[PDB]
Every structure is written in C-alpha cells, then in structure tokens.
C-alpha cells in the first residue's frame, strides 16, 4: 500500500537492504520497495539512472539508501553519484541520531543526542584550482539563505520531537564573516521559538565536550564546516558505524540512511555486517510514513535482541553472522505479531 524507493548502493549495502526486507517481510510491513541499482563501481551509473531515481522520488517522496561508492582514481567525492543524488533531491539537512542501545556497553551509556548539520554548502561547495606551480586554493561558500533553512529546520525538529534545547556549533571566532553569518541566522530564528532553549559553542570546545561529557547537549545544529566529522565522532560514542542511523531531508523528500559514513564504514566481507543502523533507520522511516505500530515493533525487536546479548555481530563483540542476527530479529518480530494483545 506504501511505495518506497530503495537504493542498495555498494559495499554491504545489498546485504543490509536484504535485512530490511526480510525483517519487513517477517513483520507484514505494508511497504513495496522500488529498487534502483545505481553503482558507479560496478558500471551501472549514468545520469539517466539518476533521473529515473528522481522520478521514483517524485512519486514515492521517501527513500531508504545505501552508500554509492566513488572510485578515487579520476574522481573526488564531490562529483560522485552520491553527491549528484543529494543535489537532484535537494537534500539539505542531515539528521544523525546518537542514542545509546541498552546492552551494547560503551563508555557513554544512556546517551540521547541528535546532530543536525547543513548538507549543501561549506565543504561540499569546495572549488579547488592551482594558482602557482605548487600552490592549491580551495574556495568555499556560506549563504544566509542556506543558514536560515537549516536553523529553521533545527527548531522545527526540536519542537516536533519534544526536544528541549538546541545548541548552535560554530567557528565564528576565526571565520568571522562566514560563520558569524550562520551564527546570526541562528539567533534570528531562535527568537521565533521561545519554548526551546538556545546556546552557542565554538567548535573546538564542542568536540572536547562530546567526548568528555556528551550528556550536556540535546540537539546540535551546525554548518558544513568540516563535513561529516562530528557525526562520525559522535557515532563512536554509541557503538560506531554499525548502529547509528541517519536521515536526510528536503523540502519534500525524506531519505533514510546510516549516520556514520566514513569510506570504510563496514568494509567487511560477505556476511559480517551489522543491520542495526539500517534496521533502525527503516523503523524511523516507517514512523515518518505514519505506520507507528510497525515502526515501533521493529525498533523494539532490534533493541531487545541486543539487550539479551545472545546474538551479537563482530562490531558488538560477538561471533554471529549477519544472517544469524537478522534471522533472530525476524524470530522476535514474528513472536511480537502473534502475541501483541
């Protein structure tokens, strides 16, 4: 009854997507996936395939995606098909959920954090050119139009999800004209939201704070100062790249992914990945589709399978396989259907 675009990507992407649907199959989730196989590494990439995806999004308005790999020989990531997608979908707000999982013990337990950063400018605006025999110049842009959009999105997210306070992370002490503009655009849109606390912090301090005492923050909004560095730092607090889920939003489109996307994110072989990040984002996606029963059910099945400690993958300190772990979440998700009351 509900069509969703699926984009398995490269790497273990196809295994994770197979986990999402064998779980969704076990839970009778009323979702039909439209798969597009867009891989530049396997020679299934072209701008006609990009357009077929925007067509699919113009109808479905919701997608769950992997990571489209880019070949580092003759291509930087800015011209990768993973960037052309986000530009053709005009995704501008990246949303990472840094939330602890009871039973996966780390050094930062009982943590509940969300990171909002802008996704269309700053680093992803970089233009590089050679000015001399051995001198490289990088040009970056910040704009008020894109700072207002991300600060408004942050406070909208903060109220819509019942979050308490919103911290604006910046480096306007040394990037005075650039990031003071973002800082100002934030303080302006904060006056329109009196029920939400608001504070700032210099980016140097925030990173130290995230690892020293992350419990202070609640929602972090920041510009694309340094790319996905903070999302990757924060995702380490809570288990790492195999558990942290992510979503990217547009004015109209919602794209649900994983939160830590360093190039070696789950660079593992044919049956070793953790489906938790993907499965949690799938459940976050179902919530967005207002299937709050199924959304809640999947998420409780996965959160409970890792609280018992029976089936654990390598990253979580365990010897089980990606098929072992999904077959256990399907076992628990079919029990949770037959005995729902």
């Amino acid at each position: 009854s509900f069509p969703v675009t699926m984009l398995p990507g490269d790497g273990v992407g196809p295994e994770l997507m197979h986990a999402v649907k064998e779980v969704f199959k076990a839970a009778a989730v009323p979702v039909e996936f439209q798969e597009h196989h867009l891989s530049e590494v396997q020679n299934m990439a072209s701008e006609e395939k990009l357009e077929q995806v925007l067509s699919s999004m113009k109808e479905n308005k919701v997608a769950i995606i992997g990571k489209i790999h880019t070949p580092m020989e003759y291509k930087g990531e800015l011209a990768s098909y993973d960037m052309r997608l986000r530009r053709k979908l005009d995704l501008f707000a990246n949303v990472v959920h840094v939330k602890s999982l009871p039973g996966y013990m780390t050094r930062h337990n009982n943590l509940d954090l969300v990171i909002i950063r802008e996704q269309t400018e700053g680093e992803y605006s970089s233009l590089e050119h050679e000015s001399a025999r051995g001198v490289i110049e990088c040009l970056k842009i910040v704009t008020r139009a894109k700072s207002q959009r991300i600060a408004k999105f942050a406070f909208d997210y903060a109220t819509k999800k019942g979050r308490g306070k919103v911290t604006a992370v910046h480096k306007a002490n040394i990037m005075k004209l650039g990031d003071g503009l973002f800082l100002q655009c934030c303080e302006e849109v904060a006056e329109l939201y009196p029920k939400i606390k608001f504070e700032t912090m210099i980016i140097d301090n925030c990173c130290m704070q995230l690892v020293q005492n992350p419990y202070q923050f609640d929602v972090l909004v920041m510009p694309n100062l340094y790319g996905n560095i903070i999302d990757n730092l924060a995702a380490g607090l809570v288990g790492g790249a195999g558990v942290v889920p992510g979503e990217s939003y547009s004015a109209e489109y919602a794209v649900f992914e994983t939160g830590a996307r360093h190039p070696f994110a789950q660079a593992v072989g044919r049956n070793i990945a953790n489906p938790t990040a993907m499965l949690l984002s799938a459940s976050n996606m179902l919530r967005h589709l207002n299937l709050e029963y199924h959304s809640s059910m999947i998420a409780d099945a996965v959160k409970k399978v890792i609280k018992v400690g029976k089936v654990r993958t390598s990253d979580m300190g365990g010897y089980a396989t990606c098929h072992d772990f999904t077959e256990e979440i399907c076992r628990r998700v079919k029990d949770l259907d037959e005995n729902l009351y």
Partner: protein, 335 residues
C-alpha cells in the same frame, strides 16, 4: 647560566595560570628569567593588524615563549592574535601530545598520542570576504613546500621521541587537490624513513576510531584544512582542557609554548582555573631548552599532586582554588 624567555600572560584565565607557573618555577629554582610582555591587537599604519613592538623585539631576542590564552572576538573584530603570532614567527609545527594522567581516572586508559598539525596555511590564510548580500566566500591555500616541511617535522619527531608509527590524517576523498598534495609529500618523506611505519587514514574514519580506541594511534600529521579538532577530541580523552599542553615549534629552535584551551571566560577571575595545561606546556619548553632535570622535577610534582587527589580543582575531581593547587605543587617541588 640563567636563560630568559618571553612570557605573555594573556587574557581571561591567562594571568592566573601564568602566575601559577611562575611560582612553581620560582619554587624549583628554575634558571629562567621571565620577560613579561603584553600582546593586544594594535592596528598598524596601513590598517594591517600588527603585534605590539615591545612583544616582537622581546621574542626576537629570546626566541622562546610561554603564553597564556588570548581573547579573540567571537563574532566580529580583530583577527586571532594567535594565528598572527604563529605566522609572524613562522612556527609551522603545532605539537599537541595527549598522554593519560596516571592519577586521574578517565573512561580511557593508557592513551599516548601526538597530534602534529601544520600551523601556517589552510584556514590561517586570513582571506574571507563578501561576494553578494548574504553570501560569504572563504579562500584557503596550502602550498607544496609547507606540506613537505610538516611531514618532515612529523617524521623527525617520531624518531627523536622513539615513536613507531606515523599516520597521515587527510580528506583526500573530498578535497582532492589539496590533500592529494599533502599525501604526495607525506609519501616522499616516508620513503626516506623505512624505520618509521607509515599509513594514511581519512579524518572522518580517524575521529570515529579514536573515541572507540585511541590505542591504535601514535603520531598523527595533519594539514590545517580541518582545524585543531582532532586534538580537541584527543583533549577530552585524558581530562579536558585543564591538562592538555601545546607547542608551536619553528625552525632554528624558536618556539612559543601555550595550551590547547582558551580564555575560559565563565571561570575567569574566580580563582578556579586549572594551571596543569600551562604548567605542562612549560615543562615542554624546559625539555626543549635542555633543562631536563628541572623538567622531570616540576612534572613529578604536578602528577604526584593530581594522584594524591587531596587538593584537586573543579575541572578535575573536586573543588579547590587554583591558588591552593599551585601551592601543593610548590610544596612538592621543594621537598
């Protein structure tokens, strides 16, 4: 003899901890004459911001420096006097060592990490301007020659201090041309030094791996394209801004030693600031100058106090004044 060194007390919690390290050095009979000089933003004739002349003639004479933190307007105003200070004396290596403190327990055990960052290019290319209304453009530049000088520094540091591994921390997947050059130069110096093991990682990988397990890392080398936020991540591993020290190293034995932390406005003037950072930078300066015995003495005094835990300070374990903490170290050094 008795060597002198330029002291810049700085702004905020600067004058307190400056006084705190001077006393521990007085209490240690340390052969050092402080030349107290002030650096504020005086604006030159052609509008180009310049250091105070009294401060520059002081540094040129002594070629050694211990400075507190400097206020930099957190919105608009003068450009950072620290970027200005680092470039006017061409201190192209910023060395930040994170080692755990044995007395102070933290969620992370036995970290030993040196972050070598290039200290003059990158976002220290101070050109940043307005294109059209509500559109700001920033121009950063990295040169070939600086990339080579910091990679050579990094490998020499790994050798002088008996470190087994060097890791180039880059974003060459995203900033092709810049970091492609830095890796290009890092790789050449690595071929001339097979004794040091070399590898490269993407910075976003490193940040995630670091907060999960710092024991994988040794010395890390970086361009100034991503700021100093890797060593800020590292600062939290061992106890925060009250303990992590710094050094800005230049050629011909010129250096200005400071701490990673800032002016600390919220605690400034309340006599609650931690002077371990500036103290540990001053033992960095001492070992730089060859005063090894005064160094080990002052450093043992500092750690043995932290280990006693009796008179700690608010950023660490419990409430005791910066004055109280500096005194129990002074008591320790003399005995």
């Amino acid at each position: 003899g008795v060597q002198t060194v330029t002291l810049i007390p700085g702004d905020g919690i600067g004058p307190e901890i400056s006084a705190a390290v001077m006393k521990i050095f007085d209490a240690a009979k340390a052969p050092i004459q402080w030349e107290e000089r002030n650096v504020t933003a005086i604006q030159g004739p052609g509008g180009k911001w310049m250091i105070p002349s009294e401060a520059k003639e002081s540094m040129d004479k002594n070629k050694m420096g211990l400075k507190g933190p400097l206020k930099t307007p957190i919105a608009a105003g003068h450009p950072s006097m620290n970027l200005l200070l680092r470039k006017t004396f061409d201190l192209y290596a910023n060395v930040r060592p994170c080692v755990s403190i044995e007395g102070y327990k933290t969620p992370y055990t036995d970290v030993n990490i040196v972050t070598i960052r290039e200290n003059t290019e990158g976002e220290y290319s101070g050109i940043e301007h307005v294109i059209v209304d509500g559109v700001v453009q920033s121009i950063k530049l990295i040169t070939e020659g600086a990339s080579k000088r910091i990679a050579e520094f990094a490998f020499e540091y790994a050798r002088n201090n008996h470190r087994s591994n060097v890791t180039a921390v880059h974003k060459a997947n995203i900033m092709r041309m810049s970091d492609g050059l830095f890796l290009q130069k890092c790789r050449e110096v690595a071929e001339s030094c097979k004794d040091i093991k070399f590898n490269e990682m993407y910075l976003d990988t490193v940040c995630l791996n670091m907060v999960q397990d710092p024991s994988q890392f040794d010395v890390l080398v970086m361009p100034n394209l991503y700021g100093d936020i890797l060593s800020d991540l590292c600062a939290g591993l061992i106890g925060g801004l009250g303990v992590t020290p710094s050094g800005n190293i230049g050629a011909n034995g010129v250096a200005i030693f400071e701490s990673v932390h800032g002016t600390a406005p919220d605690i400034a003037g309340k006599d609650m600031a931690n002077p371990t950072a500036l103290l540990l930078s001053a033992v960095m300066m001492l070992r730089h100058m060859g005063l090894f015995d005064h160094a080990a003495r002052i450093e043992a005094a500092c750690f043995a106090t932290i280990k006693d835990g009796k008179s700690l300070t608010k950023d660490l374990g419990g409430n005791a004044k910066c004055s109280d903490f500096t005194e129990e170290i002074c008591r320790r050094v003399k005995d």
